[PDB]
Amino acid sequence: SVKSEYAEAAAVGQEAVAVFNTMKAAFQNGDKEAVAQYLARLASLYTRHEELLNRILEKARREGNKEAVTLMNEFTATFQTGKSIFNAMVAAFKNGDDDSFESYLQALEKVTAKGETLADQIAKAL
């Protein structure tokens, strides 16, 4: 089964949600020095999670588990959307563009919330 690997990856996703939430508070309360620290931490988490998730997908394929593959592909689509928005948010922050940063923040909050729910549905199904 992929349960061990799924839980390992889910803990990384849980950290990304918590870090995102604190980063939002820092940005909207004017602590931009702190925002940069949280963006760097999120870059690590997105990198770690991407690689673990792709390995779970590949393991579900090696195990011949159609149900698992389907669910992990669905999670991947939402996960990779977030990673792309995150990359654009980092670029906006580098350029001092608060308007773009806030738009990307709102988009990422909704994508991460949807992924969080999806991750719950996957945990119940494995």
CB 49 within 8 A of CB 16: yes
Where do we find the tokens 């988009």?
107
The backbone torsions φ and ψ at residue 42, rounded to the nearest 5 degrees and listed phi first, read: -65, -30
Structure tokens at 45: 């988490």
Provide the residue type at 105 as one letter. L
Q: CA-CA distance, 13 to 10, in Å (whole number)?
A: 5
Say which residue the tokens 């004017």 belong to. 30
Work out the burial of residue 62: count CB atoms within 10 Å of its CB; fewer than 13 is exposed, 13-18 middle, 19 or more buried.
Answer: exposed
Residue from 11, 114, 5, 125 nearest 66 by CA: 125
CA distances from 38 to 20, 67, 115, 120 (A): 8, 35, 20, 25
User: What's the CA gap between 67 and 87, in Å, rounded?
Assistant: 31
- The position carrying tokens 């090696």 is 62
Resolution of the deposited coordinates, in angstroms?
1.3
Q: How far apart are CA 96 and CA 85, in angstroms?
A: 16
The rounded distance, in Å, linking the Cα atoms of 112 and 13 is 9
SS3 state at 6 = helix
* The token pair that represents 65 in the structure block: 């588990």
The distance in angstroms from the start CA to the end CA of the chain is 8
Which of 110, 1, 91, 6 has the alpha carbon at shortest distance from 49? Answer: 6
Q: How far apart are the C-alpha atoms of 69 and 9, rounded to whole Å?
A: 15
Of 60, 111, 123, whose CA–CA distance to 85 is shortest? Answer: 111
Contact residues for 65 (Cβ-Cβ < 8 A; gap 6+): 2
Distance CA 122, CA 126 (A): 6
